Swiss-Prot record, chain B:
The UniProt record lists the keyword Heme: no
InterPro entries recorded: 26S_Proteasome_ATPase, AAA+_ATPase, AAA_lid_3, ATPase_AAA_core, ATPase_AAA_CS, NA-bd_OB-fold, P-loop_NTPase, PRS7-like_OB
Organism, as annotated: Spinacia oleracea
Binding site for ATP: G177, P178, P179, G180, T181, G182, K183, T184
Record lineage: Eukaryota, Viridiplantae, Streptophyta, Embryophyta, Tracheophyta
A GO biological process held by the record: proteasome-mediated ubiquitin-dependent protein catabolic process
Protein name: 26S proteasome regulatory subunit 7
Pfam families: AAA, AAA_lid_3, PRS7_OB
Function: The 26S proteasome is involved in the ATP-dependent degradation of ubiquitinated proteins. The regulatory (or ATPase) complex confers ATP dependency and substrate specificity to the 26S complex.
């Protein structure tokens, strides 16, 4: 965890493709229950990719692939990483992915997607984000934590 | 500068992609085989479950059961008849006499019921995809549109007024007019408009070879319709299925009479079709038999003719909704320059105007271009024009 | 296979290199993920153990059946080739995309479960009408008229030339072009150029071929031609000799006039029926259009009208200079002498005269053709 | 000769051989031929046939 966090913060905003590939390879390794090391790797991938628009797009595609094939920890981390990639930039594809994720059975993934949606719409006052947040609040009336998020 | 540096790297990656995909297995092109990553389930258990668990249970036809007991009768169309019984996984209320079902391949006992055979001859004749004809694209027949909707859509759109009013909704509609006057262009509209199933019976799609092999198709179509909740069966070129009975001397032109009679019977009387609305379209209705056109089977007799003065303008406005033409064109002058032309003629005029404009150099249509196109489509192609020989409906 | 269709870069920009590097990285990650499955739990060869187990599970002897319905949930209803209807289910390798009536479904030999599909390589109607090779040379071999060469090009090839020009104008290609002209006008010669230049599938239909002997057959032939051409690919199907719809009466067909009428109605329906035929073009020609059914010509079924007149006195020169390109003719005669020999010498007349002159030169085994050979061919051609 | 003759005793004991006419052949020794009264089917090939 410490090593990957250091590597991520070190190369954040540098766009070095080799480090992104190394992080992806680290994520691709199936790990026994107990290791939370994948989430920091995904966040570091997002941090390295934020620098370039092409980097942002390839990171979004890789995050979609990881979500399709990722573990529970990777599934929880992907919404936060993709929200980081598109802060204050409501890209329609990312918003739709977050809308799909916010209805996941796992509550933690739901709150992660909700927080990513809030981050993406921060300061833009997007009507679509407000509407989907209203729909989620209506859905999650019974859950206190989900309503809080 | 590094022209060979990038092309070689790309070629290496492209070759390696196949060199690595061949290591999992997608090759060995078969003749109807699925992907090894598509039948994986049946390897030792699923195959031993998809195969060892089940039996063929060949399907056959039932005759009737015998009272005082289960006493069901087994009958095979091509194998043999036999006294058999159903399986332990069936109910005794559903013992339909004359029902297609399979019996235990060994026990010769019906273990699974089945729906009636589809007779693929009348199963292929379902729409399954509405045409791209919308209401806004069939302008020029507003009164006919309202009349057709009152029979196909309005009665089913809000089935509360008709019950409160206390009158049975009108039964069907026949659209007979000069050729090209917009019959199919509206039938496709009806298909893409409502949601109830629409069956397209091409007037030639009922004349079978053997004696009576055609009428059976009518019964099959009628059953496939009555099977669903609500159906609207649109038959075109209804002038072919049957015109009338005129037998004299040697028996001729009679077989079509049997087909027409069978179509009428399934359409009227003896527990009629009920929740099935007919929408026919003849182009030479002069020969239609008195019985078919008699009210109660095709009550509505809407007619679709040539737009007089404003129909042509509406056709020009609709069929030209996606043509790059000069805004200073006077279409109404064109609608007045076509004394008696068909709507398909208007669409062809818009097309020819597009072609002429694209011909030499222009990028947008010109009023003079549409004028020149009219001079050829109507004033030049008038030799046949298809109108004079069918205007009298004969 | 269809990994990435983005080639818009078409240059040495860094975007193309970045996309290729990302694709390579994704492929490497997938390969690494897949390799560990065998490294940790191979559990089998995965190359031949699976194929052998499939062969030993599915009935080794697979029969030639016929699918007749659709049962999605591990079931299917078909008839045994002997005749007995079967309730064979779906197997693991079913790949149920060809679940249509007629395709033979291969069942097991032990339990007769669906083992394999039946690859179909027949298409009898299409084959009895599919053009294999180009008929003739380029359009330059037609010669003389080219009043329809541009028109026919716009009607057929122009849609296939670059279908954005008609797209940018906001219209679709013309419906159909019917080539009517004097007997031997070269209409078939026009289809020759259409085929030699054509790009998509083309079907040839003999005019009498639509009228069959058994009642109800002709409509079936028309519907089958429509299915074959449309269901095969974008096509240009020419039903030559359309006048044979009712002009000629034969005793082979059981039905009388109400059979040619039914065939014509079926053809009209197939041309402008109640569905989307797709991207299919029709080019038919006739020599006696005075009797053709008026409904089959209304704008909407056959749109473009093309008339072919006899070769012009100025066009006759090009026709002659064309049909005699490779002939070693002696300079004794001048073609213009026979150019006006016939008052109404059609295009076929020039070819007949040239062939007769060649034959006459052949009878004497001479090397060139003399004026007398042409003189003797002219009388034998026009005068009979 | 006698050993053969006694061998034909069991030769005529085994079941006969059906007649076949391959309408279409398939790669890797696949055969779909016309059964006399039945039809066709998918099968494999023998060990010593080109
Ligand atoms: N009122 C209309 N609005 C729009 N398009 C129309 C109209 N009338 C005819 N058309 C055009 O007519 C064509 C389809 O109608 P179609 O010619 O098949 O009618 P029809 O009377 O069934 O012909 P036929 O009886 O000869 O088969 C299309 O090109 C369509 O755009
Ligand atoms: N330049 C030409 N113009 C017209 N016809 C030509 C020309 N050159 C050759 N022909 C002849 O035209 C005929 C093409 O068939 P076609 O005239 O359409 O027959 P039909 O009219 O009987 O269907 C052939 O006999 C061919 O030799």
């Amino acid at each position: 965890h410490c090593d990957m966090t250091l590597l991520s913060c070190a190369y954040a905003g540098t766009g070095n493709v080799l480090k992104v590939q190394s992080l992806l390879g680290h994520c691709a390794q199936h790990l026994d229950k107990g290791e939370t090391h994948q989430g920091p790797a995904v966040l570091g991938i997002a941090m390295v990719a934020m620098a370039e628009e092409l980097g942002v797009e390839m990171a979004i595609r890789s995050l979609e692939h990881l979500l399709q094939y990722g573990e529970q920890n990777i599934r929880r981390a992907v919404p936060l990483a993709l929200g980081l990639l598109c802060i204050s930039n409501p890209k329609v594809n990312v918003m739709d992915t977050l809308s799909r994720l916010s209805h996941d059975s796992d509550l933690e993934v739901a709150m992660a997607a909700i927080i990513s949606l809030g981050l993406i719409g921060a300061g833009t006052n997007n009507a679509r984000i407000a509407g989907m947040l209203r729909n989620l609040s209506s859905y999650y009336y019974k859950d206190a934590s989900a309503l809080f998020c | 500068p590094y022209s060979a540096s990038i092309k070689k790297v790309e070629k290496e990656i492209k070759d390696m992609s196949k060199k690595v995909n061949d290591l999992i297995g997608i090759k060995e092109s078969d003749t109807g085989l699925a992907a090894p990553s598509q039948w994986d389930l049946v390897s030792d258990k699923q195959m031993m479950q998809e195969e060892q668990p089940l039996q063929v249970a060949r399907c056959t036809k039932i005759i009737n059961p015998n009272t005082e007991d289960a006493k069901y009768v087994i009958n095979v169309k091509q194998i043999a008849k036999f006294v058999v019984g159903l399986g332990d996984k069936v109910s005794p209320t559903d013992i339909e006499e004359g029902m297609r079902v399979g019996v235990d391949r060994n026990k010769y006992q019906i273990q699974i019921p089945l729906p009636p055979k589809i007779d693929p001859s009348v199963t292929m004749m379902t729409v399954e995809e509405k045409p791209d004809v919308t209401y806004n694209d069939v302008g020029g027949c507003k009164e006919q549109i309202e009349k057709m909707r009152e029979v196909v859509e309005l009665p089913m759109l809000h089935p509360e007024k008709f019950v409160k009013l206390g009158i049975d909704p009108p039964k069907g509609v026949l659209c007979y007019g000069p050729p090209g006057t917009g019959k199919t262009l509206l039938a496709r509209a009806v298909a893409n408009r409502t949601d109830a199933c629409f069956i397209r019976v091409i007037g030639s799609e009922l004349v079978q070879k053997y004696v009576g092999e055609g009428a059976r198709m009518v019964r099959e179509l009628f059953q496939m319709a009555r099977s669903k909740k609500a159906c609207i069966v649109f038959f075109d070129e209804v002038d072919a299925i049957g015109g009338a009975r005129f037998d004299d001397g040697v028996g001729g032109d009679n077989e079509v009479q049997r087909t027409m009679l069978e179509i009428v019977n399934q359409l009227d009387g003896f527990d009629a079709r009920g929740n099935i609305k007919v929408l026919m379209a003849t182009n030479r209705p002069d020969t239609l038999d008195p019985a078919l056109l008699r009210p109660g089977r095709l009550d509505r007799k809407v007619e679709f003719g040539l737009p007089d003065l404003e129909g042509r303008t509406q056709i020009f406005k609709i069929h030209t909704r996606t043509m790059n033409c000069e805004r200073d064109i006077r279409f109404e002058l064109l609608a007045r320059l076509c004394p008696n032309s068909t709507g398909a003629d208007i669409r062809s005029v818009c097309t020819e105007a597009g072609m002429y404009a694209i011909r030499a150099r222009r990028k947008t249509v010109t009023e003079k271009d549409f004028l020149d196109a009219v001079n050829k489509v109507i004033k030049g192609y008038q030799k046949f024009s298809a109108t004079p020989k069918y205007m009298v409906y004969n | 296979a269809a990994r990435i269709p983005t080639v818009t870069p078409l240059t040495k920009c860094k975007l193309r290199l970045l996309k290729l590097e990302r694709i390579k990285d994704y492929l490497l990650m997938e390969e690494e993920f897949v390799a560990n499955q065998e490294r940790l739990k191979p559990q089998e060869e995965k190359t031949e153990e699976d194929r052998s187990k499939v062969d030993d599970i599915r009935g080794s002897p697979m029969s030639v059946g016929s699918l007749e319905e659709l049962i999605d949930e591990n079931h299917a209803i078909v008839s045994s080739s002997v005749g007995p209807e079967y309730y064979v289910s779906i197997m693991s390798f079913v790949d149920k995309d060809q679940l249509e009536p007629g395709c033979s479904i291969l069942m097991h030999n032990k339990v007769l479960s669906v083992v394999g599909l039946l690859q179909d390589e027949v298409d009898p109607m299409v084959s009895v009408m599919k053009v294999e090779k180009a008929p003739l040379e380029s359009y330059a071999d037609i010669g003389g008229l080219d009043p329809q060469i541009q028109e026919i090009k716009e009607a057929v090839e122009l849609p296939l030339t670059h279908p954005e020009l008609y797209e940018d104008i906001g219209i679709k290609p013309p419906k159909g072009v019917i080539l009517y002209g004097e007997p031997g006008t070269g209409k078939t010669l026009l289809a020759k150029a259409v085929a030699n230049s054509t790009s998509a599938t083309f079907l040839r239909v003999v005019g009498s071929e639509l009228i069959q002997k058994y009642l109800g057959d002709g409509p079936k032939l028309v519907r089958e031609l429509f299915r074959v051409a449309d269901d095969l690919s974008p096509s240009i199907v020419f039903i030559d000799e359309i006048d044979a719809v009712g002009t000629k009466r034969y005793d082979a067909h059981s039905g009388g006039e109400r059979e040619i009428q039914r065939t014509m109605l079926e053809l009209l329906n197939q041309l402008d029926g109640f569905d989307s035929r797709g991207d299919v073009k029709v080019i038919l020609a006739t020599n006696k259009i005075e009797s053709l059914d008026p409904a089959l010509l209304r704008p909407g079924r056959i749109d473009r009208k093309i008339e072919f007149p006899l070769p012009d006195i100025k066009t006759r020169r090009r026709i002659f200079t064309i049909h005699t390109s490779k002939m070693t003719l002696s300079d004794d005669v001048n073609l213009e002498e026979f150019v006006m020999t016939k008052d109404e010498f059609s295009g076929a007349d020039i070819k007949a005269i040239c062939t007769e002159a060649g034959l006459l030169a052949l009878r004497e085994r001479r090397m060139k053709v003399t004026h007398t050979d042409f003189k003797k061919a002219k009388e034998k051609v026009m005068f009979k | 000769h006698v050993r053969a003759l006694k061998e034909e005793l069991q030769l005529l004991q085994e079941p006969g051989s059906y007649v076949g006419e391959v309408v279409k052949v398939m790669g890797k020794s696949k055969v779909l031929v016309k059964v006399h009264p039945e039809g066709k089917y998918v099968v494999d090939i023998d060990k010593n046939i080109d």
